[model samples]
Target: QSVSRAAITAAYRRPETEAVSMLLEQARLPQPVAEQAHKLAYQLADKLRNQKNASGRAGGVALMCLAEALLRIPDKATRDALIRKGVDMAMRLMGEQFVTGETIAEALANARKLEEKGFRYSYDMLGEAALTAADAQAYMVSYQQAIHAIGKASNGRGIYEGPGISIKLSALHPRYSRAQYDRVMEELYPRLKSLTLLARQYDIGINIDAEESDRLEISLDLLEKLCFEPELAGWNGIGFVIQAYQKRCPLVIDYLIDLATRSRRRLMIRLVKGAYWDSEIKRAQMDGLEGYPVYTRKVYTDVSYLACAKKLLAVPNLIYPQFATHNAHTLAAIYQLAGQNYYPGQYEFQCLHGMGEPLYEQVTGKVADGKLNRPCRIYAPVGTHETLLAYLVRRLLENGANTSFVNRIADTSLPLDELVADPVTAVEKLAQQEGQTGLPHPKIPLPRD
Candidate 1:
């Protein structure tokens, strides 16, 4: 069935405020506190958006001030008071919601609570690109430990039904780049293989988190080899994420489908609205690339996401489609397109931890009342506050922007029709207005052009 915007909106049938309030309730935030924090978050978002440098250095300094306050203030009362003031307050408020735990054990315990409510989890360790051999080794150990803990927690529920782990290739190796392909293959591949084997041992899913555009081909190389590996063969626990924001996404899907077919493995592919938008634009501009590697318009990415989802659904036997989105429109469109005849391992939805719970609760579990019952996995991050600083800034930059679905979903002024408008139609209208087809966003023109 074709995905209809009217049908999806009609099915959801709730105002933005309702969803936001529900999210606040689920996140255990009081109305007054949450409203206050939301206002502060808006301010922070505005400040970040206006800066010439979208780099998070400014945000990091602001957050570090809060950390310093927490460190200097010995009294619990004063420290709590400090945290309750301004952007510092907003950071803690958002942090508690987005970050599941400071450690793997704690995160898994938290996942256990959500699991009871019919939510699955994929624990992501929060850290930036590893800068040294020691850093890479430490990350490897963290991933290995996390897998064992998640597997034991899963208790033989199997990969599709149980919680899994998402790892970053950059974090596993300091030299994860095209120039160092040989090193990555020799050094990083072993570590990747080791982690996958551990995950295989526990029979839990292991997903390779998508990074920058430059690393895509190299990551694909690793994925292709992993699939054909004699020992890792026949296990469907292997998963990979594909960012729909990239212009190359659909072609990448084609490549992945062919890869899966050749290897005869059912790979779990998580389709997400890409992160690192700001950095990607900056990188392309700085490198003086011929053209941007990703779509400049958000709606274009939405179109790409839906188109990719259609491709994934068309080949169920070869690929396990994991449609990850916070946009209700995206979620519902995929739900309807997948058809009502659901089965285990057919397809599942995903949302970020603490971010998508409110909306997802409506469609998942007994709360959904079986009208739109669908399985959803929460992308939960696990790490200490220091590690979380990078992730927190990234999340703020991502969700705090006005164009973000999460941001728009909370604004009642935006009409529901506008909120769930079909991306294909939106793009077609833009083309008509511009008197041309296939235009990059005017503001985000070709890097050096």
Candidate 2:
């Protein structure tokens, strides 16, 4: 039953281009080919907004394409007007809400809806890479506001839970100088502490998201400082992301394990196949820095990721390991290993909101069979079109050249006619027909202990 359901879900999750082709076929444009291509573009944009995949690497590439396209377009009278239009179009295509400029109340309300569906929410305030100390400070204020809102929402609930905030360190300081960044961190420390304390009070988890590789060292430094705080001791609610593509990740994991042991606190880690491969490689080439150690090959990167996963699983004190990937083989392997070792509920699978329909559904189904957890939360982005476009563009650059992904999408059971007709629509139709619904929130089977 589980295998059959996964097959159905995978069929529906076909790439967006397949649907666009179908739409083009029905429209029968004078320029059949060009019109079909245009349709495919829009469809791709739509998928960027909605598809939820465990790896999120492909989505990251799509997002990068959107961002580059928008940034290259000339700015209009109002800088945000054009960006806003792009955001709207993207949202329309994806059927997601636009909450970029909405007040905190509005955003939290949307998050509440997801929570009701048995999913945890990660709240991201849409800004990054500030140019100045002032800008960083302002962004920090916004983050604080978000944290307070989450605390308030959690307070009203008996379970002391609500959406957690995700922040980029670049938005906290200008990295032009270590002194400047250090000062920003010092200034932001009080607010960070307050937010962390408030989250602990409400049993909320704060995740510090990974950024570009150049900024990773500083990000980890900041995270370590926060983790070592006396007040944060024994708090399992704090977590940091580890990118598997980084060659140094194994060593980093070991260090974190040691930190957790010495601190006598349960450490939680969110693992992702890194998002800035292209950027990292390009920046290194441009600045004449040594190439990133993990930029050589996709297989190499995945191997590194697997190594990290293995090490993480061995850490008994590491609670709630998050495996974030879209690769079927990797997922299956992890599941098999878990079964072999009888490690139930020691780890959870994490995927983006709209990408991997089949995997989402299948994994959730396994929860009932004592293989996984049900009603897993998908990472849904709720921001204005402009913000989402920026987010989408990042996705594109990341996944566009990935051969493995290309081959997977190509091998799906989607009809060639559908792909040519209106690729995006065809993919969506295929997804629906295959029983894909972005992410499946099946009832979770309780842990057997």
Candidate 3:
């Protein structure tokens, strides 16, 4: 990774189609076609980028000048053609092979190959919170198909066992919001119960994927009701994801642990740093919400991750923890902590499928005696390129930033010690270093509008 830092970093730098144009130029495409595609792609990014706040105005505006110029023309045949071509080309680069295919059969076929490599998977069919009942019902059908496929999804003759389907609770209903919480519950619970029943029937794992922060409490409340279901009785394979970057992360972990203990059932919780940081901030700002629900600094999130990891490990019997990260340093910290409260298969690490091959080799590849080094699972996305844009954008936003964990890992000059220090200890020192010169503890700003 260190050797290819520049390549990896540059891979994310925009003009994903810069190379496409270069390749086009190399192959002698018409200049107008090549330049037009580049311009359209740049403009599209700016248009999509959240520019509500001045600081939030996106980069590449200078690149937009030419594209904006082309748009002003009365006749835009060339611009429209190039725009279509550019979107197609750019989408190809953004989620290249990240999504397996549009159908469940395709997802299973691809997963079977990964099983041969000694890796397990959890599949996310690419879609978001449903906006209409039709959309919600459509997502419901898609998941049923996916679950049915998972039941028979192995390429090898033996039947599929324990493969996971990650469902977005928001995708199940049109009114999955606080404003309509009671209505959402009335609509969502039966869907969840039926889905859980189907999953339980096939003995497949159901992972309720996390989404926006506003939905956190709603999700937990829903989880509380479904967890005690007579239909879901005795199933320990269910999982709920908790994003570590949210300010409520630690409390959320505590809630899950207690819920599991109280309900007399075990649950799985996947920990992630979060994907919608920029948009999250934009939403808060737009709503005039007092403060961002997520931690602004990256270290705080890292600290929170290990802090939560320690807590999860501290009570291994209550909740099954899946730490999803591409960071080796964070994984090292987590792996070290796992030794303290040791058990085989008590916890596992997870990573995205196409992006982390080399990382997983180090995690799962053989040791000197040739046994697998560590336990891990891959979070695989299954859909066509059309459904892939939002997820892919989240991924790029998380990684492409210079200060982000994924990008910084490629920087060899960064100190490993600082990255791997016990998170709790590090937070203590941060407080001590500030020394009670009486700095008021920063509170999340109260919401306004």
Residues 270-347, model 3: lDDT tens digits: 888888777776777678744556665455566667667777877867878888987655665566556644454678
Per-residue lDDT value at 382 in model 3: 82
Candidate 1 Cα misplacement greater than 4 A, ranges: 1-93, 177-179, 367-371
Clashing residue pairs for model 3: none
Lowest summed lDDT window (length 10), candidate 2: 440-449
Highest lDDT scorer: 1
For all predicted structures, in order, the TM-scores are 0.79, 0.64, 0.73
Query: Can you give the lDDT of residue 320 in candidate 3?
Result: 80
True-structure RMSD, every candidate: 13.9, 18.8, 17.5
Itemize residue pairs with steric clashes in candidate 1. none
lDDT of 1 by residue, 114-186 (tens): 6877779999988858888899999999898899899999999989989999999999888555447788989
Residue 118 lDDT (model 2): 48
lDDT of 2 by residue, 22-53 (tens): 22232222344335444443343234333564
RMSD of 2: 18.8
Which runs in model 3 stand beyond 4 Å of their true positions?
1-85, 154-161, 175-179, 340-342, 369-372, 412-449
Weakest 10 consecutive residues of candidate 3 by summed lDDT: 16-25
